[PDB]
Amino acid sequence: QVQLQQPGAELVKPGASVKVSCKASGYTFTNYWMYWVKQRPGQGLEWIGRIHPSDSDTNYNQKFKGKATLTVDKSSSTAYMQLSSLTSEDSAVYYCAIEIYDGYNTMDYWGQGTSVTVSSAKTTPPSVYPLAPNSMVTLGCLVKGYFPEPVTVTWNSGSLSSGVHTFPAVLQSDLYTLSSSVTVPSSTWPSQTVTCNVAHPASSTKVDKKIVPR
């Protein structure tokens, strides 16, 4: 299966450099243009450039002419986008994408996107807290005080999806905080275990917090 693998987040100090990777698998790496797209927090999509891994032919956007440098490594089937002299404007999610036409259909494949955050602050893993309290009962999960973005939240390893509201993260006093609620039948909780699964890739953190009645 065709796959484009990107790291979740990269924290880079102002003025330094970062190199975002895009590992491709499942197809012939040298057959399709590799596109890159920037999306600032809450903004639109911006085209950075494209590179053909066969001969490293590139087409750059003039706005990112000196900023972004696209390379490939064919021994690993990995594409790389290097950003230099980072500023706060360069803090965004960076996607790699390809388009494949096999002679029958045209499919698009996108990486998950790398959240590059340019800041002098250090990484802070989140503090995960259980939110414990008719026919239905609402539970919750408080993911407090982490840096930088992003974090992912699931319930019971993804088995509990309906009735879930995951609220966007808000920056407040240099740290991010989000929450997530889940509403289940009154016979599910507290009879069965309800687990909030939090992942923070920037700090290599995975916390499973049970919603214990107490």
Ligand X SMILES: CCC(=O)N(c1ccccc1)C1CCN(CCNC(=O)CCCC(=O)NCC(=O)NCC(=O)NCC(=O)NCC(=O)O)CC1
Binding site for another protein (CB under 8 A): 37, 44-47, 55-63, 95, 97, 99, 105-108, 110-113, 127, 129-133, 138, 140, 142, 144, 162, 165-170, 172, 177-179, 181, 183, 214
What is the token pair recorded at 13?
Answer: 């100090």
Q: How many CA atoms lie within 13 A of 153 on its CB side?
A: 26
Among positions 82, 87, 187, 193, the unique one binding a copy of itself when judged by CB under 8 A: 87
3-state secondary structure of 63: helix
Q: Residues for the chain: how many in total? A: 214
Q: Pattern of binders to ligand X over 26-45, x per CB under 6 A?
A: ---------x-x--------
Q: Which does 183 bind (CB under 5 to 8 A by kind): ligand X, a copy of itself, another protein, none?
A: another protein
Interface segment toward a copy of itself; rule CB under 8 A; list 9-17, 103-111, 133-141, 176-184: 9-17
Query: Terminus-to-terminus CA distance in the chain, angstroms?
Result: 46
Give the C-alpha separation, 93 to 133, whole Å.
37
Query: Looking only at Cα atoms, what is the longest distance across the chain?
Result: 65
Q: Does 108 bind ligand X (CB under 6 A)?
A: yes
Q: Please state the closest distance from residue 17 (CB atom) to ligand X, in A.
A: 23
Give the C-alpha separation, 64 to 146, whole Å.
30
Q: Does 85 bind a copy of itself (CB under 8 A)?
A: yes
